[PDB]
C-alpha cells in the first residue's frame, strides 16, 4: 500500500499554512463533510489544532481518501487565492 | 449549462501568469499520462489559454474537467508550499 499522507505529509503542509489559511482549510473541509457527516463533526474541526486536524482527516477519510480530499481543498484554496488576486487586479 | 467548463476553466486559466500556466500544463501532462500517454503533450505544451481550455473539455467533458482542474490547482498549491518548507527546513537549497 501507499500514500501515507495524513501521517507524514499533511501535518507539514498544515504547519506551512498561516492562521487565516488554516481556517480556510477547515472551512472547505466543512463543505465536503457536511453533506455526508452534517455539522456534527464540525465543532471538532474548527477548534482542532493542526495535529488534531490531521488525526480527524485520518479518521473520517481513511486510505487515499485523505489525500484526494486534501488535494481538492488545496485546489479550491488556490482558486480562492486566484479569485482574490484577480479581484485585486480589477481594482 | 455547465459554468465551469465554458467560462470557469477559461477565466482562472486566464488569471494564471506565464510561469503558473506552464506548471499547470506540466501537472496536466502528469494527469493525462495514464490514459493518453505523451501523445497530446506536444499540443498542450504550446497551446494558448483558449486552446488549452478547449483541449480539456475534449478529454474531460462534463464534471470530468472540474475534478481534473481542481486536483491540478491543488498540486500547484502544494508545490508552492513544498518549495517554501524546503527552504525553511534547509537554508542552503534553492
Residue numbers in the entry:
A (entry chain A): 6 to 96
B (entry chain B): 7 to 100
Relevant lines from the article:
Here, crystal structures of human NLRP14 pyrin-domain variants are reported. Structurally, NLRPs share a conserved tripartite domain architecture consisting of an N-terminal pyrin domain, a central NACHT domain (with reference to its initial identification in NAIP, CIITA, Het-E and TP1) and a C-terminal leucine-rich repeat (LRR) domain. Pyrin domains belong to the death-domain superfamily, which includes the CARDs, the death-effector domains (DEDs) and the death domains (DDs) in addition to the PYDs. The death-domain fold consists of six antiparallel α-helices packed around a highly conserved hydrophobic core with Greek-key topology.
